Amino acid sequence: GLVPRGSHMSGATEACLPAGQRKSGMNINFYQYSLKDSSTYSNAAYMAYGYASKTKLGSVGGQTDISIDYNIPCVSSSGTFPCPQEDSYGNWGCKGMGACSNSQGIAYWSTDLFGFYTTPTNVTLEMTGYFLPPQTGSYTFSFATVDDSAILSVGGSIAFECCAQEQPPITSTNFTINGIKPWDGSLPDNITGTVYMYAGYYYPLKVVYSNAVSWGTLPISVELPDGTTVSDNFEGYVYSFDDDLSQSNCTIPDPSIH
Ligand SMILES: [Cl-]
Ligand SMILES: [Cl-]
Ligand SMILES: [Gd]
Ligand SMILES: [Gd]
Ligand SMILES: [Gd]
Ligand SMILES: [Gd]
Ligand SMILES: [Gd]
Ligand SMILES: [Gd]
Ligand SMILES: [Gd]
Ligand SMILES: [Gd]
């Protein structure tokens, strides 16, 4: 055949070719989330778009280094230092610091989330941008763990619409990774999702992350078609573009035949 036949049942992931000035990194938007609310973020509609109905706190652009690793303070005999969760013990102390005098269960203010001053104990954030595959093939995105609730979505009309990165969130709940905190309690370290991508196309990427209490954690990785893994620092892979709703040709519904 002179041409490829295309993915079966138009199953290729939609991608984009935005024509404007590319910027390195993802945009991060921050939204209010209530301390100790362990229910709101267990709903798919909230995690897909509902988060943006709460007050927007602010934003930071140009972020390439995207994993979350937030540790609450331990107010200790020798001063105040962040405590790795695995080093916390008793009621409570932090290994190497002694007993901590402060509550685990209050809000704490910090810039650790992308330099933005907020409460990482209780917040929801939305990361948007475009993933640029350097290689054609299967990419496997993963969260190593999820504390508390998160989704990852890849593709036009799944993450967001082409050339419209800055618009209000779309309603798609067809998540690439569903790390939504279960009602039942529990969940494993499905957690991963696979997308077949064609080199040189821009794939919309959305990550929505929430925490209700204390520690927050979301280690983000992707396994490339060559079997190597990129973790935390996605520089060279993620980009933003200012909205251009007028760019008629921006959406590529089927990169497998374009
Ligand atoms: Cl601290
Ligand atoms: Cl100790
Ligand atoms: Gd990092
Ligand atoms: Gd951190
Ligand atoms: Gd940690
Ligand atoms: Gd940080
Ligand atoms: Gd669409
Ligand atoms: Gd947490
Ligand atoms: Gd592999
Ligand atoms: Gd803009």
The structure was resolved experimentally with X-ray
Estimate to the nearest angstrom the gap between the alpha carbon of 2 and the chain centroid.
40
Query: In terms of residues, how long is the chain?
Result: 258
Q: What is the residue whose two structure tokens read 């279960």?
A: 182
Q: For residue 38, how many other CB atoms are within 10 A of its CB?
A: 14
In the sheet that 229-231 helps form, which strands lie side by side, from edge to edge?
Answer: 192-197, 137-143, 220-223, 229-231
CA of 62 to the centre of ligand 8 (A): 26
Nearest to 19 by CA among 163, 164, 203: 163
Structure tokens at 134: 């350097």
Q: What is the residue whose two structure tokens read 């954690």?
A: 217
CA of 14 to the centre of ligand 7 (A): 9
Fold of 71-104: Rubrerythrin, domain 2 (6.20.60)
- Give the pairing of strands 192-197 and 137-143: antiparallel
Q: How far apart are CA 121 and CA 71, in angstroms?
A: 9
Beta bridge partners of 94: 88, 98
Q: How far apart are CA 105 and CA 103, in angstroms?
A: 5
CA of 32 to the centre of ligand 7 (A): 28
CA of 155 to the centre of ligand 7 (A): 10
Q: Which ligand is nearest to the CA of 85?
A: 5
Q: What is the residue whose two structure tokens read 């390439």?
A: 64
Give one DSSP letter per residue of 50-103, joined into a string.
GGGGSPEEEEEEEE-B--EEE--EEEETTEEEE--GGGEETTTEETTTEE--S-
CA of 133 to the centre of ligand 9 (A): 17
Domain ranges of the chain: 1-70+105-258, 71-104
Estimate to the nearest angstrom the gap between the alpha carbon of 92 and the chain centroid.
31
Fold of 1-70+105-258: Jelly Rolls (2.60.120)
Determine contact, residues 66/232, Cβ cutoff 8 Å. yes
CA of 35 to the centre of ligand 1 (A): 18
Nearest to 68 by CA among 235, 238, 239, 220: 220
Q: Which ligand is nearest to the CA of 224?
A: 9
CA of 113 to the centre of ligand 6 (A): 5
